[PDB]
Ligand binder design. Structure first.
Ligand SMILES: CCCCCCCCCCCCCC(=O)O
Lengths: 11, 261
Protein backbone atom coordinates (compact mmCIF):
# COMPACT_ATOMS: atom_id res chain seq x y z
CA UNK A 1 0.00 0.00 0.00
CA UNK A 2 0.97 3.65 -0.78
CA UNK A 3 2.95 2.38 -3.75
CA UNK A 4 3.11 5.74 -5.56
CA UNK A 5 3.88 7.69 -2.39
CA UNK A 6 6.61 5.09 -1.71
CA UNK A 7 7.85 5.50 -5.27
CA UNK A 8 7.98 9.32 -5.04
CA UNK A 9 9.85 8.98 -1.73
CA UNK A 10 12.40 6.35 -2.87
CA UNK A 11 13.23 8.44 -5.98
CA UNK B 1 22.35 28.54 18.58
CA UNK B 2 20.91 31.35 16.43
CA UNK B 3 23.35 30.84 13.55
CA UNK B 4 22.38 27.16 13.01
CA UNK B 5 18.70 28.14 12.95
CA UNK B 6 19.30 30.83 10.33
CA UNK B 7 21.21 28.31 8.25
CA UNK B 8 18.21 25.93 8.54
CA UNK B 9 15.89 28.76 7.40
CA UNK B 10 18.08 29.46 4.40
CA UNK B 11 18.55 25.84 3.37
CA UNK B 12 14.77 25.40 3.52
CA UNK B 13 14.16 28.61 1.54
CA UNK B 14 16.56 27.52 -1.20
CA UNK B 15 14.85 24.15 -1.26
CA UNK B 16 11.37 25.71 -1.43
CA UNK B 17 12.44 27.88 -4.42
CA UNK B 18 13.61 24.72 -6.25
CA UNK B 19 10.54 22.61 -5.42
CA UNK B 20 7.72 25.01 -6.12
CA UNK B 21 7.44 26.57 -9.59
CA UNK B 22 5.23 29.53 -8.62
CA UNK B 23 6.28 31.32 -5.39
CA UNK B 24 4.21 33.78 -3.40
CA UNK B 25 6.59 36.54 -4.69
CA UNK B 26 5.61 36.10 -8.37
CA UNK B 27 1.94 35.34 -7.50
CA UNK B 28 1.60 38.67 -5.75
CA UNK B 29 3.43 40.49 -8.60
CA UNK B 30 0.99 38.89 -11.07
CA UNK B 31 -2.01 39.77 -8.88
CA UNK B 32 -1.17 43.45 -8.20
CA UNK B 33 -0.09 44.15 -11.79
CA UNK B 34 3.53 44.86 -10.96
CA UNK B 35 4.93 42.12 -13.21
CA UNK B 36 5.59 43.26 -16.77
CA UNK B 37 4.20 39.88 -18.02
CA UNK B 38 1.02 39.31 -20.04
CA UNK B 39 -1.88 39.37 -17.52
CA UNK B 40 -3.65 36.07 -16.73
CA UNK B 41 -6.67 35.09 -18.79
CA UNK B 42 -9.71 35.72 -16.55
CA UNK B 43 -12.24 32.86 -16.23
CA UNK B 44 -15.41 34.35 -14.79
CA UNK B 45 -18.04 32.15 -16.52
CA UNK B 46 -18.86 29.18 -18.73
CA UNK B 47 -17.88 31.02 -21.95
CA UNK B 48 -14.64 32.49 -20.61
CA UNK B 49 -13.71 29.00 -19.38
CA UNK B 50 -14.32 27.80 -22.94
CA UNK B 51 -12.28 30.56 -24.57
CA UNK B 52 -9.52 30.00 -22.02
CA UNK B 53 -8.86 26.31 -22.88
CA UNK B 54 -5.87 27.53 -25.02
CA UNK B 55 -4.16 29.07 -21.92
CA UNK B 56 -4.61 26.02 -19.56
CA UNK B 57 -4.08 22.17 -19.71
CA UNK B 58 -6.90 19.49 -19.32
CA UNK B 59 -17.69 15.57 -19.25
CA UNK B 60 -19.83 18.50 -17.79
CA UNK B 61 -18.25 21.79 -16.48
CA UNK B 62 -18.26 21.41 -12.67
CA UNK B 63 -16.74 17.94 -13.28
CA UNK B 64 -14.07 19.25 -15.67
CA UNK B 65 -12.99 22.01 -13.26
CA UNK B 66 -12.86 19.51 -10.39
CA UNK B 67 -10.73 17.16 -12.46
CA UNK B 68 -8.43 20.06 -13.39
CA UNK B 69 -8.07 20.91 -9.69
CA UNK B 70 -7.31 17.19 -9.39
CA UNK B 71 -4.44 17.17 -11.91
CA UNK B 72 -2.86 20.18 -10.16
CA UNK B 73 -3.06 18.63 -6.67
CA UNK B 74 -1.15 15.56 -7.86
CA UNK B 75 1.59 17.86 -9.05
CA UNK B 76 1.41 19.76 -5.73
CA UNK B 77 1.82 16.48 -3.86
CA UNK B 78 4.85 15.66 -6.00
CA UNK B 79 6.41 19.06 -5.39
CA UNK B 80 5.65 18.84 -1.64
CA UNK B 81 7.25 15.34 -1.57
CA UNK B 82 10.44 16.65 -3.11
CA UNK B 83 10.45 19.54 -0.61
CA UNK B 84 10.01 17.13 2.36
CA UNK B 85 13.06 15.09 1.33
CA UNK B 86 15.13 18.26 1.66
CA UNK B 87 14.04 18.81 5.31
CA UNK B 88 17.15 17.75 7.30
CA UNK B 89 16.54 14.39 8.96
CA UNK B 90 13.29 13.62 7.17
CA UNK B 91 14.69 10.86 4.84
CA UNK B 92 16.44 9.15 7.78
CA UNK B 93 13.01 8.54 9.35
CA UNK B 94 11.28 5.22 9.08
CA UNK B 95 9.89 5.17 5.51
CA UNK B 96 6.37 4.29 6.78
CA UNK B 97 6.53 7.41 8.97
CA UNK B 98 7.63 9.52 5.91
CA UNK B 99 4.51 8.22 4.17
CA UNK B 100 2.24 8.95 7.11
CA UNK B 101 3.61 12.52 7.50
CA UNK B 102 3.01 13.24 3.79
CA UNK B 103 -0.34 11.53 3.74
CA UNK B 104 -1.72 13.80 6.47
CA UNK B 105 0.29 16.96 5.73
CA UNK B 106 0.12 17.41 1.94
CA UNK B 107 -3.40 18.82 2.00
CA UNK B 108 -2.55 21.20 4.83
CA UNK B 109 0.30 22.55 2.64
CA UNK B 110 -1.84 22.64 -0.45
CA UNK B 111 -4.24 25.03 1.35
CA UNK B 112 -1.41 27.04 2.89
CA UNK B 113 0.19 27.51 -0.50
CA UNK B 114 -3.02 27.98 -2.37
CA UNK B 115 -3.49 31.13 -0.25
CA UNK B 116 -0.39 32.61 -1.87
CA UNK B 117 -2.24 32.38 -5.23
CA UNK B 118 -5.54 33.83 -3.89
CA UNK B 119 -7.26 37.13 -3.17
CA UNK B 120 -10.87 37.75 -2.09
CA UNK B 121 -11.91 37.76 -5.78
CA UNK B 122 -10.19 34.67 -7.15
CA UNK B 123 -7.30 32.31 -7.66
CA UNK B 124 -4.40 32.10 -10.07
CA UNK B 125 -4.16 28.89 -12.03
CA UNK B 126 -1.86 27.18 -14.51
CA UNK B 127 1.18 28.76 -12.93
CA UNK B 128 -0.18 32.27 -12.96
CA UNK B 129 -1.52 32.35 -16.52
CA UNK B 130 -5.23 31.95 -15.69
CA UNK B 131 -7.29 33.63 -12.96
CA UNK B 132 -10.44 31.84 -11.95
CA UNK B 133 -12.93 34.04 -10.10
CA UNK B 134 -14.39 33.18 -6.73
CA UNK B 135 -17.97 33.88 -7.80
CA UNK B 136 -17.56 31.56 -10.78
CA UNK B 137 -16.36 28.74 -8.46
CA UNK B 138 -19.30 29.42 -6.06
CA UNK B 139 -21.73 29.48 -9.01
CA UNK B 140 -20.92 25.85 -9.81
CA UNK B 141 -23.73 23.32 -9.28
CA UNK B 142 -23.56 21.49 -5.96
CA UNK B 143 -21.55 19.87 -4.46
CA UNK B 144 -18.87 21.61 -6.62
CA UNK B 145 -19.98 25.14 -5.64
CA UNK B 146 -18.98 24.51 -1.99
CA UNK B 147 -15.56 23.02 -2.76
CA UNK B 148 -13.26 26.08 -3.06
CA UNK B 149 -15.12 28.60 -0.92
CA UNK B 150 -13.69 27.42 2.50
CA UNK B 151 -10.21 27.67 0.92
CA UNK B 152 -10.97 31.34 0.01
CA UNK B 153 -12.27 32.07 3.51
CA UNK B 154 -9.12 30.64 5.06
CA UNK B 155 -6.84 32.30 2.55
CA UNK B 156 -8.34 35.73 3.30
CA UNK B 157 -7.49 35.46 7.04
CA UNK B 158 -4.08 33.77 6.38
CA UNK B 159 -2.96 36.37 3.85
CA UNK B 160 -3.48 39.13 6.47
CA UNK B 161 -0.36 37.78 8.33
CA UNK B 162 1.65 38.95 5.29
CA UNK B 163 4.16 36.12 5.31
CA UNK B 164 6.68 35.76 2.55
CA UNK B 165 8.29 32.77 0.91
CA UNK B 166 11.17 32.61 3.38
CA UNK B 167 8.66 32.42 6.27
CA UNK B 168 6.42 29.95 4.47
CA UNK B 169 9.29 27.61 3.67
CA UNK B 170 9.78 27.01 7.42
CA UNK B 171 6.06 26.97 8.26
CA UNK B 172 5.37 24.24 5.66
CA UNK B 173 8.25 22.13 7.08
CA UNK B 174 6.76 22.46 10.64
CA UNK B 175 3.43 21.20 9.30
CA UNK B 176 5.08 18.23 7.64
CA UNK B 177 6.89 17.21 10.85
CA UNK B 178 3.77 16.87 13.00
CA UNK B 179 4.32 14.27 15.72
CA UNK B 180 0.61 13.73 16.34
CA UNK B 181 -0.44 12.22 13.00
CA UNK B 182 -2.31 8.91 13.42
CA UNK B 183 -0.30 5.71 12.97
CA UNK B 184 3.19 7.06 13.44
CA UNK B 185 5.62 4.34 14.61
CA UNK B 186 8.39 6.48 16.12
CA UNK B 187 7.25 9.97 17.26
CA UNK B 188 10.42 11.17 19.08
CA UNK B 189 12.77 11.78 16.09
CA UNK B 190 9.87 13.60 14.29
CA UNK B 191 9.32 15.85 17.33
CA UNK B 192 13.04 16.45 17.66
CA UNK B 193 13.12 17.70 14.07
CA UNK B 194 9.91 19.79 14.56
CA UNK B 195 11.28 21.41 17.71
CA UNK B 196 14.21 22.70 15.67
CA UNK B 197 11.99 23.90 12.82
CA UNK B 198 9.68 25.69 15.30
CA UNK B 199 12.69 27.53 16.81
CA UNK B 200 13.90 28.38 13.31
CA UNK B 201 10.38 29.64 12.47
CA UNK B 202 10.18 31.84 15.62
CA UNK B 203 13.65 33.42 14.97
CA UNK B 204 12.68 33.99 11.31
CA UNK B 205 9.45 35.73 12.31
CA UNK B 206 11.34 38.01 14.75
CA UNK B 207 14.03 38.88 12.17
CA UNK B 208 11.87 39.20 9.04
CA UNK B 209 8.87 40.92 10.79
CA UNK B 210 10.34 42.74 13.90
CA UNK B 211 7.41 45.19 13.83
CA UNK B 212 4.94 42.22 13.90
CA UNK B 213 4.73 40.91 17.45
CA UNK B 214 3.34 37.38 18.07
CA UNK B 215 3.14 36.55 14.39
CA UNK B 216 4.64 33.21 15.50
CA UNK B 217 1.72 32.63 17.91
CA UNK B 218 -0.91 33.73 15.36
CA UNK B 219 0.62 31.39 12.84
CA UNK B 220 0.47 28.34 15.19
CA UNK B 221 -3.20 28.97 15.85
CA UNK B 222 -3.76 28.72 12.06
CA UNK B 223 -2.23 25.17 11.97
CA UNK B 224 -5.44 24.09 13.70
CA UNK B 225 -7.70 25.99 11.24
CA UNK B 226 -5.88 24.05 8.55
CA UNK B 227 -6.80 20.65 10.00
CA UNK B 228 -10.46 21.67 9.99
CA UNK B 229 -10.53 22.72 6.37
CA UNK B 230 -8.73 19.43 5.64
CA UNK B 231 -11.34 17.39 7.54
CA UNK B 232 -14.22 19.41 6.03
CA UNK B 233 -12.58 18.87 2.64
CA UNK B 234 -12.16 15.09 3.07
CA UNK B 235 -15.90 14.83 3.88
CA UNK B 236 -17.03 16.84 0.82
CA UNK B 237 -14.82 14.56 -1.28
CA UNK B 238 -16.37 11.58 0.47
CA UNK B 239 -19.76 12.99 -0.71
CA UNK B 240 -18.47 13.55 -4.26
CA UNK B 241 -16.96 10.02 -4.46
CA UNK B 242 -20.49 8.67 -3.64
CA UNK B 243 -22.96 11.04 -5.37
CA UNK B 244 -21.04 11.21 -8.68
CA UNK B 245 -20.07 8.39 -11.08
CA UNK B 246 -18.71 9.88 -14.39
CA UNK B 247 -15.32 10.67 -12.78
CA UNK B 248 -12.47 8.71 -11.25
CA UNK B 249 -10.18 10.06 -8.51
CA UNK B 250 -6.52 9.98 -9.44
CA UNK B 251 -4.71 6.98 -7.91
CA UNK B 252 -2.21 9.12 -5.90
CA UNK B 253 -5.11 10.96 -4.28
CA UNK B 254 -6.84 7.64 -3.52
CA UNK B 255 -3.65 6.52 -1.64
CA UNK B 256 -3.81 9.78 0.36
CA UNK B 257 -7.56 9.86 1.20
CA UNK B 258 -8.42 6.26 2.13
CA UNK B 259 -8.23 5.83 5.92
CA UNK B 260 -7.95 9.57 6.50
CA UNK B 261 -10.52 11.24 8.84
C1 LIG C 1 -7.19 20.55 -3.05
C2 LIG C 1 -8.12 21.79 -2.97
C3 LIG C 1 -8.75 22.18 -4.29
C4 LIG C 1 -7.81 22.06 -5.50
C5 LIG C 1 -6.66 23.01 -5.28
C6 LIG C 1 -5.45 22.57 -6.07
C7 LIG C 1 -4.44 23.58 -5.57
C8 LIG C 1 -3.15 23.42 -6.33
C9 LIG C 1 -2.27 24.63 -6.00
C10 LIG C 1 -2.04 24.69 -4.48
C11 LIG C 1 -0.64 25.15 -4.18
C12 LIG C 1 0.23 23.90 -4.33
C13 LIG C 1 1.41 23.99 -3.38
C14 LIG C 1 2.58 23.58 -4.23
O1 LIG C 1 2.88 24.31 -5.23
O2 LIG C 1 3.13 22.51 -3.89
Amino acid sequence: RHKILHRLLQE
Amino acid sequence: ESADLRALAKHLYDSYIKSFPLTKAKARAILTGKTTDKSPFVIYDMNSLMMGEDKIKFKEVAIRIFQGCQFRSVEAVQEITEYAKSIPGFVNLDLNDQVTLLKYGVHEIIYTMLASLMNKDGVLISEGQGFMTREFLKSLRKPFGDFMEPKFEFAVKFNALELDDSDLAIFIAVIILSGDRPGLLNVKPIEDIQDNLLQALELQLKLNHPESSQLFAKLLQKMTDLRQIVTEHVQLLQVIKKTETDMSLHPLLQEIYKDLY
